[PDB]
Amino acid sequence: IVGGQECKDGECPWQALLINEENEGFCGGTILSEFYILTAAHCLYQAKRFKVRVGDRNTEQEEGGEAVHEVEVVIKHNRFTKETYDFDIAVLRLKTPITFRMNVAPACLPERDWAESTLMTQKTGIVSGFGRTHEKGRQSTRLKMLEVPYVDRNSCKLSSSFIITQNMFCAGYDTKQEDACQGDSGGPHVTRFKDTYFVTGIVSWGEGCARKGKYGIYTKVTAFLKWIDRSMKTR
Amino acid sequence: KLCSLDNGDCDQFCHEEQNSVVCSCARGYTLADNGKACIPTGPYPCGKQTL
Numbered sequence: 258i259v260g261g262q263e264c265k266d267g268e269c270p271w272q273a274l275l276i277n278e279e280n281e282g283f284c285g286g287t288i289l290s291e292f293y294i295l296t297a298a299h300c301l302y303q304a305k306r307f308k309v310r311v312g313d314r315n316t317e318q319e320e321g322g323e324a325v326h327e328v329e330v331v332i333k334h335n336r337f338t339k340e341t342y343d344f345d346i347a348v349l350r351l352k353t354p355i356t357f358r359m360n361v362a363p364a365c366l367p368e369r370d371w372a373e374s375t376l377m378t379q380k381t382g383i384v385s386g387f388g389r390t391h392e393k394g395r396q397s398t399r400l401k402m403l404e405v406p407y408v409d410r411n412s413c414k415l416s417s418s419f420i421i422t423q424n425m426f427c428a429g430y431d432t433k434q435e436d437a438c439q440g441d442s443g444g445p446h447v448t449r450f451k452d453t454y455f456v457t458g459i460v461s462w463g464e465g466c467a468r469k470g471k472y473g474i475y476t477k478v479t480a481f482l483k484w485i486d487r488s489m490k491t492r
Numbered sequence: 493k494l495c496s497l498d499n500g501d502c503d504q505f506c507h508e509e510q511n512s513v514v515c516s517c518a519r520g521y522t523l524a525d526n527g528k529a530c531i532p533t534g535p536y537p538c539g540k541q542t543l
């Protein structure tokens with residue numbers, strides 16, 4: 258996470274980390290329910306075998322409230338397309354149910370119409386992760402949370418260098434040094450409303466990390482809502 | 493009527509259905525007596541930061 262703040266106790270309880278066999282975190286994810294973690298589809302390529310980790314905010318100590326769960330099945334969106342990063346989304350089924358405690362709580366799923374209208378028109382959006390703090394730097398050791406303002410669907414398309422399809426939106430700063438970055442993929446992009454946060458985006462892709470004239474592209478969760486439903490019964 | 497004045501005075505989901513406005517809540521809540529606010533039903537509601 259380039260720039261941004263730092264998540265405090267209980268601030269980002271829906272975060273989830275995808276760790277490899279070397280036990281390094283390679284991607285992020287959002288907690289939907291005791292059994293399902295949301296995530297970016299392309300994240301299922303940088304590690305043969307992996308596990309999901311929740312309730313962790315400092316990868317090097319022990320707040321004691323961590324938890325490493327194993328994946329029973331990984332639901333990938335059939336129409337994924339690496340070459341273009343379109344339909345970039347997947348859901349993971351946990352073998353062992355998640356035990357909600359401090360620094361561990363699911364994030365609500367909005368209602369598509371209500372969302373794109375009220376949620377996606379808010380000034381900002383919360384993005385977080387344990388990812389690089391600098392474009393060429395190392396990975397984060399503390400759970401970060403930036404506040405990415407919503408970009409104009411059009412400016413977005415112009416600033417690009419690639420095609421922002423039906424299944425993705427822009428968020429972040431034109432010049433301000435604040436964006437997501439390597440290791441933050443799949444990570445949660447929640448939107449706040451009356452003190453309650455809703456999943457509205459999955460850290461997808463971007464050109465560089467916080468580059469001037471460049472934005473942040475997330476997966477438009479609102480679109481795949483019917484998909485996320487029948488996927489929480491595996492499909 | 494009009495989930496556009498201030499989200500229909502709803503705490504969450506709002507629907508302009510026909511005339512008057514209709515509120516509703518995420519999965520895990522329950523609509524309060526006034527029919528607007530959303531009350532948790534379990535220990536760790538989604539969307540709420542743990543305390």
Ligand SMILES: O=C1CN(S(=O)(=O)c2ccc3cc(Cl)ccc3c2)CCN1CC1CCN(c2ccncc2)CC1
Pocket residue numbers: 340341342419420436437438439440441442460461462463464465466467472473474475
């Ligand atoms: O420039 C980069 C940066 N990283 S990142 O730092 O780990 C990284 C990872 C996730 C991020 C997520 C956000 Cl919201 C912002 C910045 C990020 C930065 C990812 C890969 N690339 C280059 C590729 C980017 C996507 N792309 C296409 C192809 C076809 N159609 C559309 C897009 C080709 C070149």
Ligand SMILES: [Ca+2]
Pocket residue numbers: 313314315316317318319320321323
């Ligand atoms: Ca830890």
